[model samples]
Target chain A: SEEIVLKAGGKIYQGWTKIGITRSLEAMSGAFDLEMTYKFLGNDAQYKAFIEPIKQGQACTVDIGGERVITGYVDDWVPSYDESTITISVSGRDKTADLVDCSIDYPSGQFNNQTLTQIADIVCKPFGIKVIVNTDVGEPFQRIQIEQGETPHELLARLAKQRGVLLTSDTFGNLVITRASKTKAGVSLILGDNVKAARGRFSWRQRFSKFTIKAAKADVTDSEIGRYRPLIIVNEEVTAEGAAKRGQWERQRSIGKSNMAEYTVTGWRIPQTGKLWNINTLVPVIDEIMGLDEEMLIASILFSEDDAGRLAVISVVRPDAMDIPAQI
Target chain B: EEIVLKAGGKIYQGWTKIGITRSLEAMSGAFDLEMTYKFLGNDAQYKAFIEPIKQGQACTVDIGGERVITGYVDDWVPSYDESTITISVSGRDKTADLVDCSIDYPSGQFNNQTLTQIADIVCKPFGIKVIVNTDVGEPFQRIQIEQGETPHELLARLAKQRGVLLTSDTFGNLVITRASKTKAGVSLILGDNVKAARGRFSWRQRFSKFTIKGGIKADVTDSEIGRYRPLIIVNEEVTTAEGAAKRGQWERQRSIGKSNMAEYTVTGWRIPQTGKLWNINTLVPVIDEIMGLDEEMLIASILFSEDDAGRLAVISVVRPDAMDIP
Candidate 1:
């Protein structure tokens, strides 16, 4: 991960110095605003130019150290000055934010044998998200006839969650509807071997002896997993295979609950490929002192930089039993 | 070392009278017998057993039998008949609680979901496995629920309308198959089978005439069966074609049931010794003085009573041709 470059209304601010940006992605759609704060001297000339044009709806593209992190409208702008310094904070979500805010719907449908890729295309294309199906949407998907009120992203996220898939975005601002494993970073972060510090914890509070999951009242018959272990109930589009599916999901989700290890690695890359160790990627941690030597998936990561130096804080978790990716 | 009632993360033993009855369609999947016995020990069993069992607490019963019934305790009455204290216990099949629960689709629209898919959708939420043994059609156009209908009511109704049987495995998995379409096993031999026959009747339970008529659709669509007064009705709210098809089969069964030349009652230790349950759809053998009927007979129902008397099953039968027409 690296500092993200900020471009307002297709123009760069030459006067203000950059302060690192923070953004997060999840298996399913969740709200998060990318914040890019820059500081400048009190008499900077780029103040009004950056302030007036970068109002709401002004096109903005964020360039991360690796590539363009996101592109969206300039949603917010604020400036504060005291004594000899002035700091400005600009924040907004990616293009898909429009789907999150605007009202959309599926009137009525009879999508016979429609793949998840197809459904994703229907819901995401308008937002500039290129729906990518990394795996079969499972079952040629018979009649998915329904007329409901909900946002396109929300609807897709719900459907993805039900199918044991993940909905996220790529570096190019394209919506990526993929299986959880497909979102793997294709990299690893070592512990003691990486010349970095590490921390871990173990507990039983997050572990369930039995996990239960069922459909909403309407689909109970269609989605119940009777007398499960590691008890967790989910009312969604679960099938007879829902129990085994949910069983594996909770097993992975529960790993962090009971056994969690966080590390601060030097760099976010594989020495062999130099590819960035982004979030959702599996990273191996070899720590003999702590008796923890295993490959864990990156759950979340944070990178910051200033005049002094730069630091990357990475958090990882044990991958699910079935979290194998379709591609390397 | 005794009968134990396990519930609420606890267990209790020393139950004097323990009796339970499980049927496919009896109490919406099952029911419990209120047990009572004479116990002189003041062992404080009520505190351990009776108190922990509320109206709908899930529990399991281990009655020194191979099968342990997992259900809910619905009643507990302890009274003193002076000389002996009798504890009356009443419970229901575990599914009762779920049967009273409801389900629905946000919009009343259905796709190409099979009966298995639909049943799975309904039972998966409750952690129940669905064994679909019948052809329940496919690609439903639309299936909606009423204002506040329970899942059991919907399922039971659906099974009947589709001419299917919604029963359960010993482990409580829902087994949905066509109603009495096949033989379960070769049960009791005629005269050599039972200890004795209990009832006497000559075609008393059979139907003289069977009639089935296609029903009118609430909102007639081209897909509706429209009107085919072949003779009758029975699913969710049920569409015209689905309901009429089942009605015809059942009406024919009733007609054949009435066509029996003669009927008799027979009871035996055969069912007890074999440990085989009396299923309504099974083909059984019965031999009597009136011509020695040896072909398979359909069991109408099975009833049981006290102690060893529980071994005594009140058998009812109908002509095999009853299901012949459909």
Candidate 2:
């Protein structure tokens, strides 16, 4: 059963039911701000005793349809009164919001030759978040020294920026550090498989004319996108197998750049069967109206839930999502 | 001085501050070394030692004990600073020179030519000996050499495809063999044998996807390999057995390959009872601070250095597939 309930300061806000909620989860970013609205009926004891005490900065966990979409503080509590119903406009960000605002005076120390996953654990474990390292692209760094004023996320983002990977999150909000994939999920976005509708767009300008990546190791080769010529857009990051992998991705992007598609999936069902259609979830596009029959990765997702059930509008792409043929 | 140099086929003295590096990863380009010594401006002995040295002549450097590097006299330069005169010499191992030459093999198939035969065919022209210490069956398909590729590059590719390492022994003989699991007699017993050690352990179920490429019966399924972990990529290729055997091998290899990654660097050199230097793709016993009892690891690379400042040996190792659990 799909349901939405509100928690105020670790306890349920009685007589107050959530009206609706919409949350976005990104592949490159951790989480998006979750906007929700709730209502309290009658000017009676339940409203005064429960809803009135809810002030700014109180803990709030917005669980929509059996899913804990977002958990954070209540940023806004705008309330309006009618003859019998009182509606509150509540807004908050995900737990990662704390990571952004919370400063880390962790002082100074040197983490030497640590792997990406190991480094991520040190930065995120304090926040009670688990880490999943999913790739073997780049080698470990010789040393990482935290500066005086850099936040934990800032440091993590710095490390991830050099590598060809990103810091995303699971539906449960666990941290995932990985490069994109080249495979399709088990779920097919066909007309019968909970498809609301899908739109496909084709553009030649989207294709890159050239791709280049500078490797992390010195004396190691720097790879370039030689397949396409002239107008070049360079991307620098650590490749899995150094210059060879960098070149492979360069060519792959050149081939897959213009294959773009957008999908509107029925929210009631999982985006890819049991797994929420998070970022980079590959699905076979079988939409007849869009004329797209190839695999497309869920690049972005907008999940919304209300009394009319739920729906998801996901932007999908096929440009260098995963390395196929296993770049040698 | 513990330093013994065989320059231009003759043993010379007074060599100092020498360093040599050998690796299992590089095929055609194996060992590299540099040496320096004092030559008293124009001493007769200096002329005898330095004048005999010619570019492209055979040379060898023996440290306190073992013959560390065997290559040719590549280049040499002498410098004098009013009060002192010094001669510096640098050369690559036998493999480097092979990379400079090219060869072409007529397209054909050799059904049962063993590793020794292949080695003789490739190493013979360069006067390098062939020692086939291990057994590796023929590849599934015929081996083809490109139009202008060097023999070293071709051998390296073939050796890697067969999961074996190709390296030159102290005698400048190419030894083709798989990674050994034997105890190297010498041990790195924590603080005693090992000066400093660091460890890295990671479990990545993400790359557990293994796909074996059979000419006609290629299959990709998690149940065929690691059903326990969630995998999303199929990046490996093998030509071994078909169906369950291929898939099961891929699964076990991936699991063990990811789990059994213990790379370490030790100070001292590996000494076998036979008095031979350690070969790449061989094992050395390690009782590390982090890894538990009786851990035998494969030597991936080695760098031996001896200079006026100090003498040391850096050995890099990796845990074998036997360390895999399940």
Candidate 3:
């Protein structure tokens, strides 16, 4: 029943942090056309632990250049320059650090609550994640009332109001609204009938119910160099009373939840010196590294190995009408 | 027996402005860590000897991010992510500002027999070193060393050298440089053969024959005055006149010389949280209490102090158009 033992003659070296590629700043298209670069180390265990919330800009602390360059950022720039800034990093840390983090930033321009909710509903929610919203996830709401003396923007935030608040206007009338990730905080909506005069004191009504972001999908996209592929290693249940043996031991080492997540560039090549292998994607990517368009990544497993056995979820790419012949 | 204070020692200690702009090269690639960068703290030479030799002079270095953060920031939400930059710093530091050099500078062209004679007196005869200044794009250099020498002799040597070069410039063709020999301008050219035009030669010009006053010739161009005058040169410093930025006697040779430009407006400076750029892009208007010219920005990040080495990530969510879009 063991599936991770392909060790014989002419063995291929595939490990995490093994320096497959060094800073090949190539991007790929995904469901939303995301282009990103990844530093794939040669260790499998490290790969599964460090992938999520990273491809988008999140700050994580790592020991860089002998000394610590704390709060390093990774921002995703798309649409030539859409400012689709996704930043993630460990804000502050000791001079010496190890890579283990879970941070992701989404610019208001890229994924609003409704938009992100839609994406999660499509990609992550269907997979196996439960979502709990203060309000209905699929309902349209209008109007936000201020709570007593509190201003609509302050005490009753857009994400935390009980009623609808008016925020916009047109020639026809002033438009009222409630809880939306895009809505500005506080300054409640008024239920007044002053469309013509435009000069009447209007009291507020309605509060907001926070929206929920549920996951929908968890699978790799079509292209290799696009959106960084994060490996999520699910823990297994050994025999009921296994007493938590070494295999079940959970530490934040060489794992992605507390380590760096990684993907692979299949059939990676090297030009010029002709001495090429797979490489890791580091920040500040340079051009013509390893060779442009030469990097081709293949989806792999959230794989790990130990003295006892190996655990993995190897990918099975079933290309549509491409890799297979139509049945005759 | 002598308190012995002089004005020349503090000459190069004031706010000398220099123009600086970000190069286009840095923006072409690499995500701008815009948040923070690793920077060189202080000069190791000063910090190393401050305690023992200088009897505890307060040595300081610049470390980035010791300051308070503005509200705007880019976070690295790594499962792992990192950014890096390379900085190279190289400049000779001196303790004093006096440059009573041991070698004389021969002005005019390199063909004067009298100028050659002065070179022989100071460089060849007196055994003081003479060197050529060339820009090879490496670290700048010190031409000669003054040893077994007194302050008076150093003064005498500089006087003789300046006099020798001034004599060759009756028509304002030659000038005496302050700290750098190459800072002078050359005029008049002659050669016996085309091949010998670029040859190097030894010069020993006479101090008695040169102009007795300062090297400023009556006919020197106004544009050239900016380069060889004492107006700007006397005030190039990064610290106070008699305090942090002033150099020592042995450090005279390391004083500022001919440069395109240099500045010392701020010294021993610690970057504080002045939220200048924060309000520039944000949709929110400036608040009177929280934001201003001298105010600090609220740097939002999941810092180690707040978490105490625990594994965590901070996320800041923005809606499309930053609420700019409906």
Q: In terms of docking quality, how is candidate 2 classified? A: incorrect
lDDT of candidate 1 at residue A63, scale 0 to 100: 59
Mind giving the per-residue lDDT tens digits that candidate 2 earns over A240-283?
46555555555555555655576777763574456555566677
Query: Candidate 1: lDDT of B62?
Result: 59
lDDT by residue (A135-237, candidate 1, tens digit) is 5566445566533335566666656655666666655556775553535455555543664677778775666555566565111121222333345476464
Instruction: Provide TM-scores for the models.
Output: 0.41, 0.45, 0.14
True-structure lDDT of candidate 1 = 0.51
Model 1 regions lying over 4 Å from their true place: A1-4, A14-53, A64-66, A145-147, A180-188, A199-201, A212-248, A256-259, A267-272, A289-291, A321-328, B1-326
Q: Give one digit per residue, the lDDT tens place, for model 3 in B1-326.
A: 10111121221111111111111011000111111123324442112211111211211111132211111111222111133222111111011111223333443122333332333334343223332221212221222325544322443343343322111111111122111211111111111100000111101110001110122211111221111111112223324433222222112211211111111111112112341211111121111110011112111111111112221111111111211110
Of the true interface contacts, what fraction does each candidate have?
A: 0.00, 0.00, 0.00
TM-score of the A chain in candidate 1: the value is: 0.73
DockQ for every model comes to: 0.01, 0.00, 0.01
lDDT, candidate 1, B1-326, per-residue tens: 24466667877665444444444444333434444444546664333334525556677765444444566777766665533555665665555555667775565434666556767777777776776666765445556666676666666666554555666644556677544645636554433444333222222122222222224322111111111111111223445664544554464465344433332223532355445555565767654321334566766444432353433445556665554433
What is the total number of backbone clashes in candidate 3?
A: 112
